Amino acid sequence: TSLFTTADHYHTPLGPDGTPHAFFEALRDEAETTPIGWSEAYGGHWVVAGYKEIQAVIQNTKAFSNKGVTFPRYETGEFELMMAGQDDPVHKKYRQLVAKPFSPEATDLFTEQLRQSTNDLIDARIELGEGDAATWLANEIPARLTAILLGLPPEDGDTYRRWVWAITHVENPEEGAEIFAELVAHARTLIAERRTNPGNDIMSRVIMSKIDGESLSEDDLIGFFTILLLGGIDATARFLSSVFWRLAWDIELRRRLIAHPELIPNAVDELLRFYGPAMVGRLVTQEVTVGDITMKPGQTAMLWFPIASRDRSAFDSPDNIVIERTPNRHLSLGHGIHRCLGAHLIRVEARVAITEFLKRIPEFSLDPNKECEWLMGQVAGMLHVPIIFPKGKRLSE
Ligand code: HEM
Ligand SMILES: CC1(C)O[C@]2(C)CC[C@H]1CC2
């Protein structure tokens, strides 16, 4: 028997802790013998689990196209995924338009604003002694910031999350497509308003941009809106949720981050290795051999970053969260020409979220009377993290 044969990133066996990590560890073990295996899920596809094999695939853009970046394809109607779903030279020209606002200096401008935001969110339940850390904090910190980056109302996160749910999970394809069309209607309204009232936000920037002398089409602009909203609120929320869950029970990790706040950036990087939500696909466009396996045009390869992030030939003691680990060249943010546009931004969001939360609520635990829930898929992580804690005091009021 092989664990590859029924591997499916939307249906990962969960262990007694509520995560897929026992299964990932078992697949990692098998991958030492077979780093690429055939799964019969989704009609048949390749699962790439070894670290060096994922590196080989993700560097080989001639044979492995980002037209397959989501598999099964995300529900975005007739729209492509902007940047993420493109190959060069097209990909590079679109990404250049938004490189500046995602640079470390540009995103660092939001640091203290994120800190204030995080504290305002914590104020809403600190006097109560209980909350779902995912819905209360993890969902809201990145959704509010993303809203501000796109010039959306930050208070409407439930609307934005409903759109993303349709893109990533709704099973009835008519329904999912209709809800995605709601996002598209709102994007058109936003774009029309920005045209007349341009600001310093990222949508105004791409609206005023040109490629090869031509303004972007309304469709390309909707594409930018979609990928930035999607990227900004989904994997960030799942990652932060998984982190709050881990900190709720892992009292040893928690006390160390309180004692050594200077280690929080490196610990965020290690938590990205361990809880990185993402996997990505590639469409095979030319016959290619990777290790023992020859892939053929039209096949899809899924890059199982969480398994490669646990590869013993790439990391010492990969099953331990070693907060001082360097260089820690994990693949949770990708590698090569598509490497995550939001990399620096999530590092800042996570550092601030963890720092302020542990400052405000150093003592907390999982609620024994409510269930946690792990969401599976191409972006995976805790969805519900009910916690309890001693009642504390609001900063504002
Ligand atoms: C925990 C948080 C996140 C994780 C794990 C993550 C993961 C990734 C990964 C693995 C890729 C590579 C795609 C590939 O190789 O096909 C990627 C690309 C990308 N991400 Fe992120 N992402 C995160 C947050 C963000 C945020 C905050 C944004 C923007 C607000 C964002 C926007 C993008 C975009 C636009 C791409 C495509 C870049 C390109 O194609 O050149 N992501 N992300
Ligand atoms: C699912 C995932 C990882 O997130 C986005 C923003 C980047 C790569 C893919 C598709 C879209």
Curated annotation (Swiss-Prot):
<dbReference type="InterPro" id="IPR001128">
    <property type="entry name" value="Cyt_P450"/>
</dbReference>
<feature type="binding site" description="axial binding residue">
    <location>
        <position position="340"/>
    </location>
    <ligand>
        <name>heme</name>
    </ligand>
</feature>
<feature type="binding site">
    <location>
        <position position="338"/>
    </location>
    <ligand>
        <name>heme</name>
    </ligand>
</feature>
<keyword id="KW-0408">Iron</keyword>
<keyword id="KW-0503">Monooxygenase</keyword>
<feature type="binding site">
    <location>
        <position position="91"/>
    </location>
    <ligand>
        <name>heme</name>
    </ligand>
</feature>
<comment type="pathway">
    <text>Terpene metabolism; 1,8-cineol degradation.</text>
</comment>
<comment type="subunit">
    <text>Homodimer.</text>
</comment>
<comment type="similarity">
    <text>Belongs to the cytochrome P450 family.</text>
</comment>
<comment type="function">
    <text>Involved in the degradation of cineol (eucalyptol). Catalyzes the initial hydroxylation of cineole exclusively at the pro-R carbon to give the (S)-6beta-hydroxycineole. Cineole is the natural substrate of CinA.</text>
</comment>
<keyword id="KW-0560">Oxidoreductase</keyword>
<dbReference type="GO" id="GO:0046232">
    <property type="term" value="P:carbazole catabolic process"/>
</dbReference>
<dbReference type="InterPro" id="IPR036396">
    <property type="entry name" value="Cyt_P450_sf"/>
</dbReference>
<keyword id="KW-0479">Metal-binding</keyword>
<dbReference type="Pfam" id="PF00067">
    <property type="entry name" value="p450"/>
</dbReference>
<dbReference type="InterPro" id="IPR002397">
    <property type="entry name" value="Cyt_P450_B"/>
</dbReference>
<dbReference type="GO" id="GO:0005506">
    <property type="term" value="F:iron ion binding"/>
</dbReference>
<dbReference type="GO" id="GO:0016709">
    <property type="term" value="F:oxidoreductase activity, acting on paired donors, with incorporation or reduction of molecular oxygen, NAD(P)H as one donor, and incorporation of one atom of oxygen"/>
</dbReference>
<feature type="binding site">
    <location>
        <position position="95"/>
    </location>
    <ligand>
        <name>heme</name>
    </ligand>
</feature>
<keyword id="KW-0349">Heme</keyword>
<protein>
    <recommendedName>
        <fullName>1,8-cineole 2-endo-monooxygenase</fullName>
        <ecNumber>1.14.14.133</ecNumber>
    </recommendedName>
</protein>
<dbReference type="GO" id="GO:0020037">
    <property type="term" value="F:heme binding"/>
</dbReference>
<feature type="binding site">
    <location>
        <position position="282"/>
    </location>
    <ligand>
        <name>heme</name>
    </ligand>
</feature>
<feature type="binding site">
    <location>
        <position position="235"/>
    </location>
    <ligand>
        <name>substrate</name>
    </ligand>
</feature>
<feature type="site" description="Controls regioselective substrate oxidation">
    <location>
        <position position="235"/>
    </location>
</feature>
<feature type="binding site">
    <location>
        <position position="66"/>
    </location>
    <ligand>
        <name>heme</name>
    </ligand>
</feature>
